[PDB]
């Protein structure tokens, strides 16, 4: 999107020192999210290589790379799993009332999506409790 084009930090690192460099990186304010939040020290990443450091690239991105191995399913893209999971809570609305012996089980598979729903985005599954 965004985050991973900064150029001027190239333009701070040789005026200023590859040390201001990384200090400029990281009081930006628009890292929120965990997408923007690990390509920024891939951006710390790529400052670091050009001008002669060499060595701190190592561990700005061993410090990148376990993480890395992270962030699987809803992490990433949170904009697309909140579609999948608001669907299957509006489609178990309909299934019911045809069959009134089996629903003593449906807890699970509601207050689980449910549950699933909080942890991703409070603001829009408000108006997802109403009866």
């Known amino acids: 999107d965004i985050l991973s084009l900064e150029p001027e930090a190239l333009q701070i690192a040789d005026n200023e020192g590859t040390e201001a460099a990384?200090?400029?990186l990281q009081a930006?304010?628009?890292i929120q999210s965990d997408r923007s939040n690990w390509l920024l020290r891939l951006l710390m990443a790529r400052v670091a290589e050009q001008?002669?450091?060499n060595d701190l690239?190592?561990?700005l991105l061993a410090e990148l790379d376990e993480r890395a191995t992270r962030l699987t399913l809803s992490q990433w893209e949170p904009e697309l799993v909140?579609?999948?999971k608001a669907?299957?809570?509006k489609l178990l609305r309909m299934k019911s009332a045809k069959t009134e012996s089996d629903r003593v089980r449906l807890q699970p598979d509601m207050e689980h999506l449910l549950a699933g729903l909080i942890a991703i985005?409070?603001?829009r599954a408000a108006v997802l409790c109403n009866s």
Request: glycine share 10%; net charge positive; charged share 30%.
């Open 28 to 30: 930006r304010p628009g």
């Open 22 to 24: 990384l200090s400029w």
């Open 57 to 59: 690239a190592l561990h």
């Open 51 to 53: 001008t002669g450091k």
């Open 82 to 84: 909140f579609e999948v």
């Open 121 to 123: 985005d409070a603001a």
């Open 87 to 89: 669907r299957r809570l």
